Amino acid sequence: RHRKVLRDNIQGITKPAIRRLARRGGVKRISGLIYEETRGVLKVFLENVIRDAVTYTEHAKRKTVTAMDVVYALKRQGRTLYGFGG
Amino acid sequence: VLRDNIQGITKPAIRRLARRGGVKRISGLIYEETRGVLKVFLENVIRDAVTYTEHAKRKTVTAMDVVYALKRQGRTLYGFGG
Amino acid sequence: RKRSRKESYSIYVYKVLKQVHPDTGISSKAMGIMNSFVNDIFERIAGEASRLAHYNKRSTITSREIQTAVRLLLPGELAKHAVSEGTKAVTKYTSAK
Amino acid sequence: RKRSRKESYSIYVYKVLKQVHPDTGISSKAMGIMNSFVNDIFERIAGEASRLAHYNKRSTITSREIQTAVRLLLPGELAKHAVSEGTKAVTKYTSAK
Amino acid sequence: KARAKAKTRSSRAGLQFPVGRVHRLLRKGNYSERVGAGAPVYLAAVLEYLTAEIL
Amino acid sequence: KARAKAKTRSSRAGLQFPVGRVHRLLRKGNYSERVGAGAPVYLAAVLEYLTAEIL
């Protein structure tokens, strides 16, 4: 058998979920090639933020990533986040 | 005769700038809109500049005020000190 | 029995809310939002004031510097009204010692 | 006879330039550019270090914090080579007291 | 001594937001070496007005 | 006393950028209360490397 669920990866971010997301942005009609590209885009964003978060985590000699690290890592990219402390 | 002075930013100079930006062909209506856009940018900067100016109780605008006001709008500028 | 102590701006936000809309409540998440918002604005203003001070080789942050930073960061009419409140506050505080 | 004193990083840049390309000069404007560049990077790194320290409730800025800030601000290979140079410098400084 | 009873600086300012906590936060936080008495009142007032507008 | 002759910290580092001026700039600038000896050497090396790359 070969499942590895659909890639054991980003492909669990299913199509209709992206559809709902595009619906939030007011969009009506989407092409079939969008999905994959969006996924790649998402990955890049996450990568950068997570990297920074992990780096903050590494400075405190912890093995648990806290919310605060995510907040700060987001703040440095100009995407400050409210509602989780800081 | 003077013409609100925004007209000192003439057509051919704007054409030249657009040429530096890779533009080949320009409609006639661009000019007015561009002028307005330019005005807005300047206004914001100078406001901040003058604010820094007002804080020192000086009457002479210095480069540093402009540099700071530019820095705070996310358009940091190099080559005039600081 | 060991116990810590985390401060916030909650209680004060609650007071203000009861002043402006007596028959209205507010959830914990939103209060957290307001807490983070207050912290963010505080940080911006203090940092900007610091930068102004350092640029003019003055070692004291005063009301003047705060006023300046407010005019820089905020736009227009919001700045004017807030500045009004600040000036009124200083005038009241300085008199009734 | 009254006279001031404005410091800059000019001379050090000149040394570096002669080290890397002996038969080459540089104009004043570009030297000013390099001066501004240096000051900007210095400000970013120190500011970020400060923010890291304040977030972990440590009141000392050490080499560790700088190293972390560098890994945060700069991307990839530039960071790796820079970090290596810095580590080498610390290792040389600490030994030859 | 007399030890006049202490009212809060907030109560002198006629404000609800605090002052003393703000002063402490300005001292700890590497913003300046010294802080003048007037600053935190101004700052607190600004915060109050913004918070009132939002709510 | 002996008063060994003072070589620069830069020379100990084998660098061309300075160190002492950086130390002063970190003390004045409200970045932290105290600064450790290792930091400015690290920062100096970083500045020199970047400068060399650009030139």
Q: What is the 3 state secondary structure string of D49-86?
A: HHHHHHHCCCCEECHHHHHHHHHHHCCHHHHHHHHHHH
Q: For chain D, how many helices (H) and strands (E)?
A: 4, 1
C50 burial (CB, 10 Å; 0-12 / 13-18 / 19+) is buried
Cβ–Cβ < 8 Å for D95, F11: no
Q: Please check whether residue E31 touches D, CB under 8 A.
A: no
Determine contact: C54 vs chain F, CB below 8 A. Answer: yes
State in words which class domain C3-97 has: mainly alpha
Helix/strand/coil (H/E/C) assignment for every residue in chain C: CCCCCCCCCHHHHHHHHHHHCCCCCCCHHHHHHHHHHHHHHHHHHHHHHHHHHHHCCCCEECHHHHHHHHHHHCCHHHHHHHHHHHHHHHHHHHHCC
Cβ(F19)–Cβ(F40) under 8 Å? yes
Please enumerate residues of D whose Cβ is less than 8 A from a Cβ of A.
48, 51-52, 55-56, 64-65, 68, 71-72
Residues facing residue F35 across a β-bridge:
D61
Nearest-angstrom CA–CA distance, C3 and B37: 57
Torsion angle of C-alpha atoms C42, C73, C85, E53, degrees rounded to 10: -80
Say how far apart CA D16 and CA F16 lie, in whole Å: 7
Q: Name residue, tokens 């100096």.
A: F44
Measured CA to CA in angstroms, residue D65 lies from A1, B19, C46, D50, D60 at distances of 49, 46, 23, 9, 9
Buried b (16+ CB within 10 A) or exposed e, A62-78: eeeeeebbbbbbbbbee
Name the nearest CA neighbour of F44 among F19, F8, F25. F19
Q: Residue D26: how many CA atoms within 13 Å on its side-chain side? A: 22
Residue E35, helix vs strand vs coil: strand
| Angle between helix D63-73 and helix D76-95 axes, rounded to 10 deg | 160
- CATH says B1-82 is which class? mainly alpha
SS3 B56: coil
Contact residues, chain C, for A80 at CB < 8 Å:
40
Give first-to-last CA distance, chain C, whole Å: 42
| CA angle, A6 then A9 then A15, to 5° | 60
**Residue D88: CB partners within 8 Å, gap ≥ 6?**
F45
Task: Collapse the DSSP code of A59 into the 3-class scheme (helix H, G, I; strand E, B; otherwise coil) and give the result.
Answer: helix
CB D70 within 8 A of CB D79: yes
**Chain C residue closest in CA terms to A68:** C36
C-alpha–C-alpha distance, residues E13 and C93, integer Å = 5
Q: Can you tell me whether residue A22 is helix, strand or coil?
A: helix
- Angstrom distance (rounded) from CA C13 to CA C17: 6
Q: Which two tokens stand for residue D95?
A: 């030994």
- Contact yes or no for D19 and F42 at CB 8 A: no
CB pair distance less than 8 Å for D16 and F25: no
- d(C-alpha D28, C-alpha E47), whole Å: 47
Chains that touch B (3 or more CB pairs under 8 A): C, D
Return the ∠ at Cα C6 (arms to C3 and C10), rounded to 5°.
Answer: 135
Going from N- to C-terminal start, the domains of chain B cover: 1-82
Question: Residue for token digits 């700088």?
Answer: D66
CB contact under 8 A, F12 and D67: no
Query: In sequence order, what are the residues at sequence separation of 6 or more whose Cβ sits closer than 8 angstroms to the Cβ of residue B48?
Result: B65, B68, B69, B72, B73, C72
Tokens of A63: 């093995």
**C93, E41 contact by CB (below 8 A):** yes
- Ramachandran bin of F14, using left for φ above 0, alpha for ψ from -120 to 50, beta for the remaining angles: left
CA C35 to chain CA centroid, nearest Å:
11
Name the B residues in 20-59 with CB < 8 Å from any C CB.
Answer: 48, 51-52, 54-56
State whether A72 and D68 contact (CB < 8 Å).
no
Residue spans per domain, chain C? 3-97
Neighbours of chain C (3+ CB pairs under 8 A): A, B, E, F
Q: Which of D11, D87, D73, D17 lies closest to D41, judged by CA?
A: D73
Q: What technique solved it? A: cryo-EM
∠ CA C22-C23-C26, rounded to 5°: 95
Contacts 24+ apart (CB under 8 A), C7-14: C7/E21, C8/C35, C9/C34, C9/C35, C9/C38, C9/E17, C10/C35, C12/E16, C12/E17, C12/E18, C13/E51, C13/E55
φ, ψ of residue F34 in degrees (nearest 5): -135, 155
With H, G, I as helix, E, B as strand and everything else as coil, classify residue A64.
coil
The CA-CA-CA angle for residues E44, C73, A85, to 5°, reads: 60
CB D31 within 8 Å of CB F8: no
Distance from CA of B25 to the nearest CA of C (A): 37
- CB-nearest to F43 from D37, D45, D96 is D45
Cβ contacts from D onto F, under 8 A: 113
- Please tell me what resolution, in angstroms, this structure has: 4.3
Closest-CA residue in chain F for D31? F55
Choose the closest CB to D55 out of A52, A55, A72: A72
Taken in order D26, D27, D28, D34, the sign of the CA dihedral is: negative
| Both structure tokens of B1 | 């005769």
- F45 to chain D: closest CA residue: D86
Find, in chain C, the residue whose alpha carbon is nearest to that of E11.
C93
Rounded Cα gap, residues E46 and F14, in angstroms: 52
Alpha helices (H) in chain E, listed in sequence order: 9-13, 20-27, 38-54
Angle between helices C63-73 and C28-55 (to 10 degrees): 110
**CB neighbourhood size of D95 (10 A):** 8
Tell me the chain A residues in contact with residue D64 when contact means C-beta distances shorter than 8 Å: 59
Block residue for tokens 């970047």 = F50
Query: HSE (CB half, 13 Å, CA atoms) of D8?
Result: 15
Length of chain E: 55
C-E contacts at Cβ under 8 angstroms = 110
Q: How far apart are the first and last CA of chain A?
A: 47
CATH of domain A7-86: 1.10.20.10
Calculate the alpha carbon distances from C18 to C21, C25, E55 in Å: 5, 8, 10
Burial B39-78 (b: 16+ CB within 10 A, else e): eeeeeebeebbebbbebbeeeeeeebbbbbbbbbeeeeee
Which neighbouring-strand residues pair with E35?
C61
Residue F46: φ, ψ to 5°: -65, -45
Residues of E in contact with F31 (CB under 8 A): 30
DSSP label of E36: -
Structure tokens at D41: 């990077």
Q: Which residue of C has its CA nearest to F29?
A: C54
Distance CA A85, CA F16 (A): 44
Shortest Cα–Cα distance, A51 to chain D (Å): 8
Give chain A's radius of gyration (CA, Å).
16
Q: Which amino acid is at F38?
A: G
Please state, in angstroms and rounded to a whole number, the distance separating the CA atoms of residues D42 and F43: 8
Q: How far is B22 from chain C (nearest CA, A)?
A: 34
* D36: number of Cβ within 10 Å: 20
What is the spatial distance between Cα A30 and Cα A16, in angstroms, rounded to a whole number? 11
Scan for tokens 């030994």, then name that residue.
D95
> What is residue A61's DSSP assignment?
T
Contacts of F32 (CB under 8 A, 6+ apart): D49, D50, D53, D59, D60, D61, E30, F26
Stretch (H or E) spanning F35: strand F34-35
Place of tokens 């600038």: F29
Q: Is E34 helix (H, G, I), strand (E, B) or coil?
A: strand
Distance of CA A67 to the CA centre of its chain: 14
Scan for tokens 């007596």, then name that residue: C22
* SS3 call for B13: helix
Q: Which residue type occupies A33?
A: L
Distance CA D2, CA E50 (A): 49
Q: Which of C11, F21, F28, B9 is nearest to F8 (CA)?
A: F21
Helix, strand, coil shares of chain B as percentages rounded to 5? 60, 0, 40
Taking CB atoms and an 8 Å limit, are A55 and D71 in contact across chains?
yes
Q: Are residues C35 and C8 in contact, defined by beta-carbon separation less than 8 angstroms?
A: yes
Q: Residue F34: in which H helix or E strand, if any?
A: strand F34-35
The position carrying tokens 């002052």 is E19
- The helix or strand, by DSSP H or E, that contains position B50, with its residue range, turns out to be helix B30-55
Closest residue, chain E, to F30 (C-alpha): E30
Q: Closest partner residue to D68 among A59, A68, A76, by Cβ? A: A59
